[PDB]
């Protein structure tokens, strides 16, 4: 299942294909397979709203605002690993979640309907 989450950065995104196929595969044990299936749903609920519909390591067109800890985004991209940088951007998640639905998904969704 999991592996190499510890010491790498970005090269962990090379192996983001085993991380899903093993994922999701009385009454007290039946809380499992409900919240377990509510997860993989409620993110893919909003993942279709992100624009990236399936699994593609993909880019949107919303800007990264540089107010959100602008620290050497070519340099920290490769050396300084995840679980460190995640705490740095742990504060700004909800605000991006408003920008996932307004930039591409209020304007650009109603611009292909012009034709």
């Amino acid at each position: 299942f999991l592996g190499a989450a510890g010491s790498t950065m970005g090269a962990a995104s090379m192996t983001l294909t085993v991380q899903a196929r093993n994922l999701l595969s009385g009454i007290k044990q039946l809380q499992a397979r409900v919240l377990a299936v509510e997860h993989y749903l409620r993110d893919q609920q909003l993942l279709g709203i992100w624009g990236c519909s399936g699994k593609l390591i993909c880019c949107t067109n919303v800007p990264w605002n540089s107010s959100w800890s602008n620290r050497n985004l070519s340099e920290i991209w490769d050396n300084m690993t995840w679980l460190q940088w995640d705490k740095e951007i742990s504060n700004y998640t909800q605000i991006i979640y408003g920008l996932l639905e307004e930039s591409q998904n209020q304007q650009e969704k109603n611009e292909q309907d012009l034709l």
Partner: protein
């Protein structure tokens, strides 16, 4: 000129309040109602993950305490209720034509299969399961309901593997020498844990895991006295125990298809139940402990030991299961030693006096009363020594006593190596794409 992207990254490592299920493997009380156990060779070792545990604050201990009490009560359901016997029992001492001097030969009335017909029989009981009112009441008819256990199940610890739910992960550090908590660098993940045995006792764990190199004292606040100080043992100690009474077990039917067992008679060598401990093995243990308590209290401290204070013998002495019998054994010859000043502090076997009870109250849940069916033959069970409980009581001199009473501390003693993480696979890392 940065343009944020969306990922399915690995770092999900948050707290996991969660449920959990088992992977255990006859209709013995575990009932094999988990899953068939996979060979799970998947301790996937990870590289350099600084993660700190908290063995004192997790829900794995809290669920484990909730599971077994519910599970063991589930085995108690289809058995015979058997409360017509709470009547005016009258007894005497066991007669021996003459001698001097733990048994009571009891005159006794009871119903039969038919509703009206009575039954004047006799049986035997111990000391601590009967009370004076000569009329002798049972020990629990203040407020209880006596319940026989079914004589087919076993009270043996059959080990339980645990597995994570589909979407979480079980984490364990293979690292060494925690002080209870610790930012353990090396770590591996599993979907399924190892087998842990359903044992239950106080003042001494048994049949447990072993240490790495030495004693690992475990607590929260050593400067607090009200803690329960855990002591991990390096090298296990053989404990032989017995109930050397050739005993005859007879059977009767109390009513409409409700069987009942009772101690009929013993063949004739009245003895006392006991346990041997190798003497020179035990002194070799305690030198390791004071070697570490110098490091946590001071170089000029006097380490004393004593027995338990009082309360019930469930709190006072060593609670102990053995082979379908529930012992209670006095352990005064194990903590009669004082180690002095932390500077220059065989072929023998000390033996402890052990008592026998039949009417138990498991986990202090008052009202539930389970009966012990006495069994035929003799009793022998051998166990390692793995875990100890000490209590700092309230000069540099210091006395310790064998504490205990919460069985949660027993399961926390053998589940400190684990933690569970929730999984939220979503990463938003900017690059220069824009399109």
């Amino acid at each position: 000129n940065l343009w944020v992207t969306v990922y399915y990254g690995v770092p999900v490592w948050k707290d996991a309040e969660t449920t959990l299920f088992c992977a255990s493997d006859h209709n013995v009380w575990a009932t094999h109602a988990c899953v068939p156990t996979d060979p799970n060779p998947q301790e996937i070792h990870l590289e350099n993950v600084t993660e700190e545990f908290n063995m004192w604050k997790n829900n794995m201990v809290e669920q484990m305490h909730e599971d077994i009490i519910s599970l063991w009560d589930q085995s108690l359901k289809p058995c015979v209720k058997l409360t017509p016997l709470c009547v005016t029992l009258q007894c005497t001492n066991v007669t021996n034509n003459i001698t001097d001097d733990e048994l009571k030969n009891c005159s006794f009335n009871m119903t039969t299969e038919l509703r009206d017909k009575k039954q004047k029989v006799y049986s035997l009981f111990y000391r601590l399961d009967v009370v004076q009112i000569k009329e002798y009441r049972l020990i629990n008819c203040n407020t209880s309901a006596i319940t026989q256990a079914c004589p087919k199940v076993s009270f043996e610890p059959i080990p339980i593997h645990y597995c994570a739910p589909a979407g979480f992960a079980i984490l364990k550090c293979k690292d060494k020498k925690f002080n209870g908590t610790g930012p353990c660098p090396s770590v591996s993940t599993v979907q399924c844990t190892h087998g842990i045995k359903p044992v239950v006792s106080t003042q001494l764990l048994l049949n447990g895991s072993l240490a790495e190199e030495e004693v690992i004292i475990r607590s929260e606040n050593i400067t607090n006295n009200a803690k329960n100080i855990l002591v991990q043992l390096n090298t296990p100690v053989q404990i032989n125990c017995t109930r050397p009474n050739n005993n005859t077990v007879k059977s009767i039917r109390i009513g409409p298809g409700q069987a009942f067992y009772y101690t009929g008679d013993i063949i004739g060598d009245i003895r006392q139940a006991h346990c041997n401990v190798s003497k020179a093995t035990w002194n070799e243990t305690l030198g390791k402990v004071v070697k570490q308590l110098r490091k946590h209290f001071g170089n000029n401290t006097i380490i004393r030991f004593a027995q338990s204070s009082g309360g019930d013998l469930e709190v006072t002495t060593h609670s102990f299961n053995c082979g379908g019998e529930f012992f209670y054994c006095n352990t005064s010859g194990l903590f009669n030693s004082t180690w002095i000043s932390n500077t220059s502090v065989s072929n023998d076997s000390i033996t402890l006096p052990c008592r026998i009870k039949q009417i138990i109250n498991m986990w202090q849940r008052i009202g539930q009363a389970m009966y012990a069916p006495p069994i035929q033959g003799v009793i022998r069970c051998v166990s390692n020594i793995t875990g100890l409980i000490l209590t700092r009581d309230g000069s540099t001199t210091e006395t310790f006593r064998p504490g205990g009473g919460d069985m949660r501390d027993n399961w926390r003693s053998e589940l400190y190596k684990y933690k569970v993480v929730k999984i939220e696979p979503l990463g938003v890392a900017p690059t220069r794409c824009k399109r």
